[PDB]
Amino acid sequence: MINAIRTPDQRFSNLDQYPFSPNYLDDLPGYPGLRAHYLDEGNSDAEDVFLCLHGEPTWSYLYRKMIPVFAESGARVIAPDFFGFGKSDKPVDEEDYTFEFHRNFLLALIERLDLRNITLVVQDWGGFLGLTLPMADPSRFKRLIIMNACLMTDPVTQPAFSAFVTQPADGFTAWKYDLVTPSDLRLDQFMKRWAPTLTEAEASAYAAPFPDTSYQAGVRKFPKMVAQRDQACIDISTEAISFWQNDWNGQTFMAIGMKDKLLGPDVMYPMKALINGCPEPLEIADAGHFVQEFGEQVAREALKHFAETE
């Protein structure tokens, strides 16, 4: 019904530091015939579940250094790959991807696996989407781990969540230009630019999912939805502000990648004020946009923070 293609399994043969077994679901309600890939690590009967959401233009591969720290703590870790990324199937038309299409996939996933006692782990698009999930069923969420992200509200209600789009020129403008303009987009070279510490092996793991441009419709669409917020997204993200400010009663841990040009300190401090009970943030000086690349530290510190409250 929704024309999609699937990445040949062979593309993932030689992944570096990725020993996690695949789990798939192809019976989601609303997503008929589309297969979703997710990691389900640690004790599947754990009381605590960490739901790790990725963003643009990555995949679960991005949480590979956090996963084992969470799992060794006794938790069940879930890390899905959004349609269009990693090992999930990729709709071929950029028009199929919308804020709600990915949002609904997430609610569908949570219902299907019946996840409870969730510690939400977000960043980038994983947070734009993820920060709007607790208000739909608050009883299932208990903690939040937030890395560089915010809500895609309208420019007036929150100017900090709009300003980064236009400035600086080497910030979101450069990122977007790099992503939606080349006709021969190489995600390994893009990653090495925006995540300078990656090795060549890690870099290639982010290009693994896309053998050629036909597979990258979802990759091309994310940047454009940041820049051109559809109504439902604005209403949805605006009502979530209300949720974090007055309804949230959970424990929160915030980590900021200080070298980020897009969603750094000028976007994080304002987020921090909006989340009821958010404590002092852990600032990671050598981290860029992809804070997960310095994940072992973030994962340990967060469990250390959450422990000193149990």
Tab-separated table of C-alpha atoms in Angstrom, residues 23-256:
chain	number	residue	atom	x	y	z
A	23	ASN	CA	13.906	-8.276	16.161
A	24	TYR	CA	11.247	-7.318	13.629
A	25	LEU	CA	7.527	-6.516	13.578
A	26	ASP	CA	5.560	-6.373	10.300
A	27	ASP	CA	2.092	-6.275	11.807
A	28	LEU	CA	1.823	-2.767	13.160
A	29	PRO	CA	-1.660	-1.259	13.053
A	30	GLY	CA	-1.505	1.532	10.373
A	31	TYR	CA	1.753	0.226	8.814
A	32	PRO	CA	0.624	-2.887	6.827
A	33	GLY	CA	3.365	-4.880	5.180
A	34	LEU	CA	6.156	-2.539	6.510
A	35	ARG	CA	8.760	-4.297	8.654
A	36	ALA	CA	10.328	-2.413	11.586
A	37	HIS	CA	13.653	-3.440	13.182
A	38	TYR	CA	14.330	-2.977	16.969
A	39	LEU	CA	16.911	-4.148	19.521
A	40	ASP	CA	15.566	-5.731	22.740
A	41	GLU	CA	18.518	-6.234	25.036
A	42	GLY	CA	18.880	-7.229	28.716
A	43	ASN	CA	16.242	-9.069	30.800
A	44	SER	CA	12.959	-9.015	28.985
A	45	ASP	CA	11.157	-9.293	32.286
A	46	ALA	CA	12.998	-6.299	33.773
A	47	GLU	CA	10.835	-3.869	35.645
A	48	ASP	CA	12.671	-0.950	33.934
A	49	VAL	CA	12.675	-0.448	30.154
A	50	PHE	CA	14.988	2.146	28.455
A	51	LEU	CA	13.419	3.258	25.130
A	52	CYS	CA	16.237	4.640	22.960
A	53	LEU	CA	15.130	6.863	20.076
A	54	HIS	CA	17.493	7.900	17.327
A	55	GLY	CA	17.408	10.907	15.028
A	56	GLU	CA	18.694	12.249	11.681
A	57	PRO	CA	20.407	10.555	9.839
A	58	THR	CA	21.265	7.685	12.149
A	59	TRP	CA	19.880	4.367	13.486
A	60	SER	CA	20.015	2.225	16.595
A	61	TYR	CA	23.705	1.789	15.805
A	62	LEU	CA	24.013	5.137	17.467
A	63	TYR	CA	23.212	3.806	20.942
A	64	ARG	CA	25.718	0.959	20.713
A	65	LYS	CA	27.911	2.215	23.587
A	66	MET	CA	24.948	3.006	25.885
A	67	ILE	CA	23.032	-0.194	25.354
A	68	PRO	CA	25.314	-2.472	27.388
A	69	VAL	CA	25.579	-0.057	30.258
A	70	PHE	CA	21.834	-0.016	30.646
A	71	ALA	CA	21.505	-3.745	30.174
A	72	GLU	CA	24.230	-4.494	32.794
A	73	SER	CA	22.164	-2.436	35.240
A	74	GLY	CA	19.310	-4.954	35.060
A	75	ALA	CA	17.190	-3.072	32.573
A	76	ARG	CA	15.468	-4.067	29.345
A	77	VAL	CA	16.630	-1.824	26.498
A	78	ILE	CA	14.502	-1.143	23.420
A	79	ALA	CA	15.949	0.710	20.493
A	80	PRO	CA	13.948	0.868	17.329
A	81	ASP	CA	14.973	1.979	13.872
A	82	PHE	CA	12.474	4.460	12.315
A	83	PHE	CA	10.966	3.492	8.973
A	84	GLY	CA	13.395	4.899	6.418
A	85	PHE	CA	16.440	4.032	8.602
A	86	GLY	CA	18.695	1.274	9.851
A	87	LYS	CA	17.165	-2.137	9.247
A	88	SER	CA	13.514	-1.075	9.016
A	89	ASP	CA	11.904	-0.833	5.577
A	90	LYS	CA	12.111	2.507	3.760
A	91	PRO	CA	9.121	4.088	2.018
A	92	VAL	CA	10.276	5.395	-1.310
A	93	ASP	CA	8.334	8.717	-1.502
A	94	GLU	CA	9.317	11.682	0.697
A	95	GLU	CA	5.647	12.513	0.901
A	96	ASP	CA	4.932	9.404	3.094
A	97	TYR	CA	6.978	10.703	5.878
A	98	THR	CA	5.301	13.135	8.200
A	99	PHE	CA	5.611	14.022	11.911
A	100	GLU	CA	2.521	11.952	12.717
A	101	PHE	CA	3.551	8.985	10.522
A	102	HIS	CA	6.669	8.551	12.698
A	103	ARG	CA	4.839	9.547	15.864
A	104	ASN	CA	2.149	6.976	15.395
A	105	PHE	CA	4.685	4.276	14.638
A	106	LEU	CA	6.050	4.917	18.117
A	107	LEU	CA	2.755	4.717	19.944
A	108	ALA	CA	1.992	1.593	17.952
A	109	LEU	CA	5.364	0.063	19.007
A	110	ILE	CA	4.794	0.935	22.672
A	111	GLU	CA	1.306	-0.603	22.606
A	112	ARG	CA	2.458	-3.776	20.759
A	113	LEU	CA	5.288	-4.572	23.131
A	114	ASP	CA	3.266	-3.225	26.097
A	115	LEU	CA	6.240	-1.309	27.537
A	116	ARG	CA	5.903	0.146	31.001
A	117	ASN	CA	8.252	1.762	33.538
A	118	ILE	CA	9.869	3.583	30.598
A	119	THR	CA	12.955	5.669	30.817
A	120	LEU	CA	12.820	7.709	27.644
A	121	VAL	CA	16.257	8.255	26.035
A	122	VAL	CA	16.140	10.962	23.372
A	123	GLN	CA	18.142	13.156	21.102
A	124	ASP	CA	17.400	15.140	17.881
A	125	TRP	CA	14.487	13.749	16.049
A	126	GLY	CA	14.217	11.078	18.587
A	127	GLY	CA	13.422	13.888	21.037
A	128	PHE	CA	11.279	16.040	18.738
A	129	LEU	CA	8.990	13.003	18.472
A	130	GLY	CA	9.664	11.382	21.787
A	131	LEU	CA	8.968	14.404	24.032
A	132	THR	CA	5.400	14.267	22.666
A	133	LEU	CA	4.698	10.673	23.737
A	134	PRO	CA	4.294	10.832	27.538
A	135	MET	CA	1.152	13.066	27.354
A	136	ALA	CA	-0.569	10.301	25.401
A	137	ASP	CA	-0.315	7.744	28.214
A	138	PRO	CA	1.531	9.125	31.175
A	139	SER	CA	1.235	6.019	33.347
A	140	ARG	CA	3.754	4.262	31.114
A	141	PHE	CA	6.602	6.816	31.539
A	142	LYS	CA	8.734	7.218	34.596
A	143	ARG	CA	12.110	8.763	33.738
A	144	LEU	CA	13.729	10.850	30.973
A	145	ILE	CA	17.245	11.082	29.695
A	146	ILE	CA	17.556	14.118	27.428
A	147	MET	CA	20.488	14.891	25.111
A	148	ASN	CA	20.528	17.842	22.525
A	149	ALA	CA	16.880	18.174	21.357
A	150	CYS	CA	13.770	20.367	21.932
A	151	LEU	CA	10.221	20.692	20.768
A	152	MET	CA	9.196	21.778	17.259
A	153	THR	CA	6.776	24.439	18.500
A	154	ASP	CA	5.973	27.715	16.579
A	155	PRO	CA	8.488	30.572	16.552
A	156	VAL	CA	6.455	32.777	18.885
A	157	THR	CA	5.725	30.499	21.838
A	158	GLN	CA	9.369	29.423	21.870
A	159	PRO	CA	11.846	31.471	19.800
A	160	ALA	CA	14.816	29.377	20.969
A	161	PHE	CA	13.374	26.328	19.086
A	162	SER	CA	13.159	28.180	15.817
A	163	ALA	CA	16.149	30.552	15.802
A	164	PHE	CA	18.843	27.841	15.142
A	165	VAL	CA	17.266	27.200	11.707
A	166	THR	CA	18.447	30.548	10.309
A	167	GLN	CA	21.601	31.094	12.349
A	168	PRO	CA	24.434	30.459	12.285
A	169	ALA	CA	25.243	29.773	8.579
A	170	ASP	CA	27.559	26.875	9.576
A	171	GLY	CA	24.794	25.390	11.845
A	172	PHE	CA	21.448	24.002	10.800
A	173	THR	CA	21.798	25.712	7.363
A	174	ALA	CA	24.970	23.811	6.605
A	175	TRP	CA	23.579	20.569	7.980
A	176	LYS	CA	20.463	20.769	5.853
A	177	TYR	CA	22.389	21.845	2.730
A	178	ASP	CA	24.670	18.796	3.229
A	179	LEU	CA	21.668	16.450	3.507
A	180	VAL	CA	19.012	17.525	0.979
A	181	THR	CA	21.167	18.918	-1.813
A	182	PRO	CA	23.574	16.341	-3.016
A	183	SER	CA	22.380	13.951	-5.600
A	184	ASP	CA	25.080	11.527	-4.364
A	185	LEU	CA	24.774	11.715	-0.605
A	186	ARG	CA	27.389	9.658	1.188
A	187	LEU	CA	26.381	9.272	4.888
A	188	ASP	CA	29.836	8.045	5.954
A	189	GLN	CA	31.515	11.348	4.776
A	190	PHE	CA	28.623	13.434	6.183
A	191	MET	CA	29.039	11.665	9.575
A	192	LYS	CA	32.790	12.157	9.661
A	193	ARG	CA	32.171	15.856	9.287
A	194	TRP	CA	29.525	16.233	11.936
A	195	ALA	CA	31.102	13.607	14.309
A	196	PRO	CA	34.840	14.087	13.830
A	197	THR	CA	35.907	11.383	16.330
A	198	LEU	CA	34.199	8.505	14.555
A	199	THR	CA	36.617	5.985	13.094
A	200	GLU	CA	36.227	4.946	9.514
A	201	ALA	CA	34.522	1.712	10.587
A	202	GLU	CA	31.867	3.545	12.608
A	203	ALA	CA	31.351	6.019	9.765
A	204	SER	CA	30.652	3.260	7.256
A	205	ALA	CA	28.123	1.696	9.690
A	206	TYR	CA	25.957	4.859	9.262
A	207	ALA	CA	26.040	4.515	5.490
A	208	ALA	CA	25.313	0.813	5.678
A	209	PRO	CA	21.589	1.177	5.458
A	210	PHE	CA	21.582	3.115	2.157
A	211	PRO	CA	23.089	1.357	-0.853
A	212	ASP	CA	21.993	4.232	-3.125
A	213	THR	CA	19.795	7.372	-3.095
A	214	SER	CA	16.542	5.391	-3.658
A	215	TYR	CA	16.855	4.232	-0.093
A	216	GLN	CA	17.188	7.776	1.361
A	217	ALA	CA	13.723	9.400	1.072
A	218	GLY	CA	13.354	9.500	4.851
A	219	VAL	CA	16.837	10.900	5.211
A	220	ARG	CA	15.942	13.813	2.839
A	221	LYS	CA	12.598	14.593	4.527
A	222	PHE	CA	13.655	15.124	8.214
A	223	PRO	CA	15.551	18.344	7.634
A	224	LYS	CA	12.687	19.716	5.653
A	225	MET	CA	10.203	19.044	8.400
A	226	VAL	CA	12.386	21.092	10.803
A	227	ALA	CA	12.300	23.997	8.481
A	228	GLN	CA	8.610	23.621	7.459
A	229	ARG	CA	6.511	22.645	10.483
A	230	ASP	CA	2.991	21.334	9.410
A	231	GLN	CA	0.100	22.298	11.721
A	232	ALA	CA	-0.343	19.021	13.590
A	233	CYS	CA	3.338	19.118	14.654
A	234	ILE	CA	3.023	22.617	16.048
A	235	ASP	CA	-0.179	21.828	17.943
A	236	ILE	CA	1.293	18.534	19.127
A	237	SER	CA	4.641	19.992	20.316
A	238	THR	CA	2.880	22.992	21.905
A	239	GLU	CA	0.618	20.840	23.985
A	240	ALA	CA	3.671	18.827	25.114
A	241	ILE	CA	5.266	21.960	26.574
A	242	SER	CA	2.319	22.077	28.963
A	243	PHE	CA	2.893	18.388	29.866
A	244	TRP	CA	6.564	18.805	30.828
A	245	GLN	CA	5.921	22.048	32.737
A	246	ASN	CA	2.851	21.036	34.833
A	247	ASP	CA	2.228	17.270	34.538
A	248	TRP	CA	5.546	15.594	34.581
A	249	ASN	CA	6.551	14.230	38.008
A	250	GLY	CA	9.313	11.849	36.949
A	251	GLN	CA	13.067	11.876	37.369
A	252	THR	CA	15.036	13.585	34.632
A	253	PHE	CA	18.659	13.558	33.604
A	254	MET	CA	19.980	16.107	31.032
A	255	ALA	CA	23.287	15.939	29.116
A	256	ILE	CA	24.398	18.663	26.682
